[PDB]
Amino acid sequence: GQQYSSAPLRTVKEVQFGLFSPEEVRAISVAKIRFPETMDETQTRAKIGGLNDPRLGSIDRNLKCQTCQEGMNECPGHFGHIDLAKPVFHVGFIAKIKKVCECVCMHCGKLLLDEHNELMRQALAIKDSKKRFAAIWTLCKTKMVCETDVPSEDDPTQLVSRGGCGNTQPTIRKDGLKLVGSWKDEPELRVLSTEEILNIFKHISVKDFTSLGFNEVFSRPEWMILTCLPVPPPPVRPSISFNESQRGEDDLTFKLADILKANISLETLEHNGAPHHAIEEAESLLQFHVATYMDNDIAGQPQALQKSGRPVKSIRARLKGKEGRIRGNLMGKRVDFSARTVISGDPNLELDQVGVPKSIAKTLTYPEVVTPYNIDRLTQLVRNGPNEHPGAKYVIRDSGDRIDLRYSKRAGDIQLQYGWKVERHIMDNDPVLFNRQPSLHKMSMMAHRVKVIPYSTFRLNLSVTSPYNADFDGDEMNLHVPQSEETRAELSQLCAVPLQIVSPQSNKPCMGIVQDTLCGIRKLTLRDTFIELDQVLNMLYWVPDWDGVIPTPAIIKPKPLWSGKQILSVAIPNGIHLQRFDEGTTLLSPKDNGMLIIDGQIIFGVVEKKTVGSSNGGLIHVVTREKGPQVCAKLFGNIQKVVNFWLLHNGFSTGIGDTIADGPTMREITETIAEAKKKVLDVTKEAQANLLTAKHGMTLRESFEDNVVRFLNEARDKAGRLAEVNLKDLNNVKQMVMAGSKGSFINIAQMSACVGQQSVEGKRIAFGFVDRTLPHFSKDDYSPESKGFVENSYLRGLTPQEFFFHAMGGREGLIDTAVKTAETGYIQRRLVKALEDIMVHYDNTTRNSLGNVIQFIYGEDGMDAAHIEKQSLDTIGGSDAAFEKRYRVDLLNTDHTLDPSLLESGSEILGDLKLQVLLDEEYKQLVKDRKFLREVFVDGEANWPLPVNIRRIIQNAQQTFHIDHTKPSDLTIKDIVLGVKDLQENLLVLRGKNEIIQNAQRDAVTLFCCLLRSRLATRRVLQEYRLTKQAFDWVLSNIEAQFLRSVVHPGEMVGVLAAQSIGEPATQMTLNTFHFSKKVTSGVPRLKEILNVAKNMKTPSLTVYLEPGHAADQEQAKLIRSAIEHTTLKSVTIASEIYYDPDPRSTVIPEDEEIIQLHFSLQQSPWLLRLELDRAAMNDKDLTMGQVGERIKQTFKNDLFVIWSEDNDEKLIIRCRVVRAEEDHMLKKIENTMLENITLRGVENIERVVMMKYDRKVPSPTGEYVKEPEWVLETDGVNLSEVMTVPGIDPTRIYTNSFIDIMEVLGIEAGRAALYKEVYNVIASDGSYVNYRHMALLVDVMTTQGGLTSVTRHGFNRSNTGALMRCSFEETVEILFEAGASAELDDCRGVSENVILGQMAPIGTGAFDVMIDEESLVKYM
Amino acid sequence: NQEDSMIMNQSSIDRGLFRSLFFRSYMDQEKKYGMSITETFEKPQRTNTLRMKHGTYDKLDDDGLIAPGVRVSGEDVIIGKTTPISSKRDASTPLRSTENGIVDQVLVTTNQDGLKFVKVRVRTTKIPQIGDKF
Amino acid sequence: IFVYQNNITPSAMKLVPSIPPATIETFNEAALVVNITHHELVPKHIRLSSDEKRELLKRYRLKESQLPRIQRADPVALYLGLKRGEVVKIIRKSETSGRYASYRICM
Amino acid sequence: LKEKAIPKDQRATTPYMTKYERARILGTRALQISMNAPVFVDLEGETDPLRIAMKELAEKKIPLVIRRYLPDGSFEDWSVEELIVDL
Ligand SMILES: [Mg+2]
Ligand SMILES: [Zn+2]
Ligand SMILES: [Zn+2]
């Protein structure tokens, strides 16, 4: 850096990894490093001709470099070299060297397996440089002969010489950093010398090693072995030289002197009187120091510790992540022009502003270039100085030399010159990046307008609290000041707060009204709330935009009074039209329910969380989409300014009074808890009296506990609901719950009525002590009181027992939180590191740094997630009769035409056959759409997020044109029919003059058009909306415009987007799956399970659906449950016995005296095996004695004699004798095969099968979708392949949480579908919503390479992506070592490589190039 | 006072509410490098090639220590010390950049070895402000 | 296509690639009981002709490597008798567009 | 190769300007304006290089051209003058 150089300035387009040849190492070297010493010889404390040494770079601030004579800052440093006394293995290649040895003849250097071998021929064909070496190794490793001759391809009888000697190959093992071979009375054992290995490698043919993973030019296998060691210059190993009489050499400088010392020891030892078994000693030492220098943390070897005992930094350890060069110095950096302080919110800053403390503003600078525009201002700032606020700190001349205004003797008489830079203070409205770490979002870093303020905290608008996830509980934030006119433009035009308002994470806004303003807005907007003139005038003035027009009061005659609703609508801009229905809202909104804003005026409904919050159909969501992100950001401020002012004067509080519930309501709660406790006891005695019958697939204990905790919860809920109801509307806690500002039911419930049952690990407090939860209780006490049910409210106070059990469950929370914060952290990173390089291209395609297609068009529709809104697809639902009434037009039917009251043409349109052909086709298409939609969304769900809010367009049109819902339209049938048809052709996502790209286009707009045809049908357009030609034409031009606006922008870094959009919601998960249908593992642990593509999953299960015409029949369901649920002989057996009953015709056992007499009317072993079966067990599993018997009979065939008692006999018995010395010992083996091995009925792995009456939305004969509940089977095991073929089931519908299995049986395509479902169900369970495309992209990425690619170290990170890119995640040094050994070439298209190289990445703003056209330039002047 | 922030009575803050003292103790030793060669507590000055600090040395007395009454600031040298090499070299202790106060108590003793040992404490009063936690 | 009950001996299995250009398929009777292609989650896979595939790569400026893959052993790949290199056009219904088409190249 | 340049006739990227192309044009032009480059629009008392650049873009008097790279390495060049600026 810094001085001028004539050398051409280019950018790194490629990185060619390879290995150093010793020859290169010498050529490239500036010094032959000879002595371990650093200086002080001849006396002089100044670098020696041996180590460090000037030839390499400077130690001092000398200006000298000897080599370049440039001086510390400019000089990069130059490599020296050490010639090693013997060759040594490069520690990082020992395993590869071993594998190369295993592939080649350790004598003639020929590759052990020729193109003569068929398997080898297939292995050789492998194009992957690494996968080839893998296949080659596996084939050659088990070849212990270097063949002289081999059978010819023509005939295997007449053998052909392939070349090569006839030597036996050794069985190589790794013993430390040595390789030992074993050839073939008794095997020959000897170490393989580094020289010998090297010589054999030098003899491997180019064709042979390029067939292995290697490269003739860049990485010849012989270069894995080191002979000439490069010596890194001082800037790699800086001598931190403090004072004069002291220095401080780097770890690497010591380790190199150790290498040097060991080397001279060896070279002097071998040259002189070599004892040859003292030479091998010093050589092992040199091998150790050269190994331990590069990697010190070697597998099962001692660490090469310092004097101190301190392990020694290996070069490896330097680069090894989180703090390595890669993760800590390159993907992350500490940076200049950055600030940080405590944040505290401000109601008087605008949404997009940031309060910067004067001190911070006075430190951070912007380099402004002196130009005729600012020359005057800039001279004032320079005059002001570095101490006054709007001032400057430095003046940079043309010369490039910096003037310090703090000390310059000319600081007062500086006369600026165009071209000079004035490093001025950051002033109001400078764009700056503001950030709250962890940065899990696009929104965790947004651009703000500076507002220089007093006091030491960063001030922010409260509505921007939510995207940052900031509190003022003492939170600090980072500010980053851009320095280019260009990087500011980036901040302002791409990441400024107003733009970031409607987030693509959930196609909804990520900011809304909160806290005071949310609480106060409900309060202001009540029917009961009225404002006197005095205050109305202040509340108006406070709105900075206010047109200066005092609105006419709602009440005039008794007293001029305005309503809350009224004067709040002053902040709501004109043309804002919102409609919402809650509970039972009518147009005469009785409860002040729902919301109705017309032309930006509140007609009815209280303004709370659903309206003014960060809601999907938000007042914010609409104001952005309709008026601009700017207009919307203003609205945040305006709403705040009014509401906050009104609340400042109304006031708001909370006290113990607000937790206090009515005396009789308390009596009612105490009773509710009491009756529940008794309901529990009644069950507790029922189970103690053995009358309680266990639930299917549940222990008596499991069954009892389920009921108990169900009652004790039902109890807490009811008790709370009593307080909730009894709390007046004046209850401050209720008031906060109502606005939605803070709190919920459970908060009220726990504080006022009852805290509830405490739980740890899903169950009530367990007996930690022998049969008791605490010593304060008696043994075997299953009571609500003993197992942790907190009878009391927070108001009443907990008992000592209650207090501890609460503390037990409480602690489980704190741990689980701590653990999830960790677990979700990594999940986010692996998601990001797996999707980084995914971007939308100028061809609407979604590709990675390899240009491999992931999505053929972003999120299957090609739309930007932010420009989407949930919309209803009308044609899907309802009766066919109601659809007909809505959409059918029949100009040939006197009572099914359009009345002339609807359009002018009405009278003359009746009977028009040619026109009926248009409406007939129009309707035939609406019918087509209806059946298609019903194929897509099977449940008949109509509300789907789509891109153009058509409802709003028609709304605005009606308002705009003052559509009179009385006089007939001037539209024609052709105007509507063909106008809609023509609009469809202009909704372009993909442009391309070919059938592929064009059909792609048709598909991408298939759903939107369905909605379009649905909303703009002839009858709707004329009868419903009462559109004029003008109005209609406008609706069309707007749908078109809005649609085009909605498509994704090429450059969209859609990969990171998706990653973060799944990741950040994961960090907000409570979990695991409540504290108790099936209890399937969910949230963070199941998400970890998914991304890892874990084979052994926690809750594997099937969902078997019954055959179509069998859904209602429970008996059919029972039959299948019976047919699939696995049953063993073990499960029905009481006991197994061996007797000595020598006569088969008689019996010692008198019970069986009857059993023999019968099974011996219409030679054997004297030893009998008798099994007693449990009637009860046989009854739950609906088994017969003969059923069991026959199963045993077929298991042993003609080898075991089976007799059995009948289903009537008092005791259920099975008698077994063996067929045809040492016989008794055999029966014990049979009894194990009988219990353990034998399967009676059911499918293996399918362990517990539950019957469930699931609801199902299905079309009725009449047409309308109707709840048709079906019987369904839930498994406790997986065997898809087998349960699919079972009769009585719907194999077209069967599902499994194990998508690994779906992939295996139904294909990668179905595997993708199931994978999405499972990812979605993790997110959906936590309530939270993530837009389809994000989850789709992750799922698509894990699937493109046919099969399930994990989001792990050995998943995505083992792709053919950039070596530099992949090292940036998890296997860093190992990755880079393989890069050299296989001569990898990094394309440099991954974000990561350009981040490492400090180059403008091909991302967003980097996706294209900018050029000056001299032609147009000369045309403009 | 939104999102866990609070309003405080300025009038009360003045009257002394939640106002606190703050002390910091800085320490040094006259190290004995080899035999006879010892570090010296003294107010140094520009002599041959000594790497002196940027801060004000003028607050130090001849003993290389500030007097207890004195008000210190920024990088003001609170302990003056020299190290000899083979004239002198600086080894003086300046007050923490990010801090300021009034010299509180200055302690002059001997460490077990028999060498000069010094502890300088600086007192500052910290009045509740806008970013302060409670 | 040989539909076998339990097993085809490895001595018999040697004969499968023994008579080219003709290709031989071994299918276990038990796997064929249920037509997996009929499943809810299984979309329609369409085998593309040499010309159809050539056009695909042309129109998206693709190298075969760039195309999303399907294993030669994938249940649907086996059903359609897909050979290496054969490209399949997969048409699935979408909640975003109505219908979406992906392509998968064989391995 | 120069099979790289896709011709004006038969070009298929959006005839509209991307949010990024706008951010980079405005930035580039403001940077150029800021370091005393000739301005093609009449500054009607304007002084912020971004505000001047915005005026330049608004009058389509920006003499830059966007080179849109395709995944294969080919490209379509589009002039600031010809791109639709909806945004
Ligand atoms: Mg906090
Ligand atoms: Zn140099
Ligand atoms: Zn050989």
XYZ file of C-alpha atoms in Angstrom, chain A residues 368-374 418-419 442 484-486 488-490 492-494 841-843 845 847 851 864 990-993 1040-1042 1044-1045 1049-1053 1389 1400 1404-1414 1416-1417 1419-1421, chain D residues 10-28 30-41 43 46-50 52 54 60-72 76-77 80-81 86-87:
116
model
C -15.734 15.458 1.151
C -14.006 16.612 -2.036
C -13.510 20.411 -2.449
C -15.663 21.302 -5.448
C -17.324 24.642 -6.533
C -20.530 23.494 -4.839
C -19.074 22.965 -1.336
C -10.707 22.015 -5.852
C -9.647 18.405 -5.586
C -31.305 -7.967 6.542
C -17.758 7.281 -0.711
C -20.433 9.299 -2.520
C -21.114 5.766 -3.959
C -23.701 6.474 0.727
C -25.885 6.025 -2.344
C -25.856 2.306 -1.563
C -29.698 5.529 1.079
C -31.047 3.811 -2.072
C -30.909 0.200 -0.865
C -29.640 -13.817 -12.600
C -30.510 -11.467 -15.442
C -32.307 -14.554 -16.999
C -32.962 -18.105 -13.031
C -27.956 -20.035 -9.448
C -23.860 -21.398 -12.246
C -40.023 -10.290 -4.940
C -39.829 -13.908 -18.621
C -39.025 -12.343 -21.970
C -37.598 -14.684 -24.607
C -38.597 -15.364 -28.216
C -50.116 -4.294 -15.271
C -47.829 -1.640 -13.698
C -48.129 -3.062 -10.143
C -44.327 -5.604 -13.336
C -43.101 -3.739 -10.164
C -34.613 -7.885 -9.353
C -31.608 -9.686 -10.921
C -28.804 -9.255 -8.420
C -31.183 -10.187 -5.513
C -29.070 -12.081 -3.013
C -17.388 -15.996 -8.283
C -16.352 -5.807 -5.328
C -26.685 -7.058 -6.045
C -24.933 -3.765 -6.999
C -21.967 -5.945 -8.272
C -24.098 -8.115 -10.677
C -23.332 -5.878 -13.666
C -20.749 -3.467 -15.061
C -20.929 0.248 -15.707
C -19.448 1.797 -18.823
C -19.184 5.357 -20.272
C -20.549 5.747 -23.787
C -18.586 8.533 -25.537
C -24.150 9.586 -25.687
C -21.676 11.823 -23.799
C -24.852 13.839 -27.638
C -25.507 15.408 -24.139
C -22.830 18.197 -24.827
C -32.718 -10.253 -29.675
C -31.921 -9.121 -26.069
C -34.141 -10.433 -23.206
C -33.356 -8.883 -19.793
C -35.992 -6.481 -18.193
C -36.480 -3.340 -20.225
C -36.731 -1.791 -16.687
C -33.842 -0.673 -14.421
C -33.057 -2.923 -11.322
C -32.992 -1.373 -7.800
C -29.264 -2.131 -7.840
C -28.608 -0.621 -11.274
C -30.305 2.585 -10.002
C -28.322 2.590 -6.722
C -25.053 2.055 -8.720
C -25.901 4.625 -11.409
C -26.791 7.250 -8.825
C -23.671 6.399 -6.779
C -21.336 6.303 -9.787
C -22.630 11.275 -7.784
C -19.014 10.056 -7.294
C -18.018 11.351 -10.747
C -19.936 14.697 -10.182
C -18.291 14.902 -6.691
C -14.811 14.597 -8.108
C -15.490 17.532 -10.567
C -16.780 15.686 -13.668
C -18.827 17.666 -16.248
C -22.587 17.726 -15.373
C -25.049 17.156 -18.278
C -28.078 18.663 -16.570
C -28.327 22.319 -11.784
C -28.447 22.047 -6.830
C -25.306 21.189 -4.751
C -25.507 17.584 -3.421
C -23.849 15.232 -5.959
C -26.584 12.696 -5.294
C -27.429 16.403 -9.102
C -30.824 12.148 -9.503
C -32.005 10.635 -18.818
C -28.819 12.738 -19.454
C -26.509 10.103 -17.793
C -23.948 8.883 -20.388
C -23.410 5.491 -18.706
C -24.364 2.013 -19.963
C -25.052 -1.137 -17.846
C -23.277 -4.312 -19.008
C -25.667 -7.091 -17.806
C -23.767 -10.338 -17.343
C -25.445 -13.667 -17.930
C -24.384 -16.827 -16.046
C -22.453 -18.160 -19.061
C -26.567 -7.380 -22.904
C -25.574 -3.662 -22.713
C -29.342 4.458 -18.724
C -31.113 6.561 -21.416
C -40.489 2.653 -12.393
C -39.002 2.037 -8.826
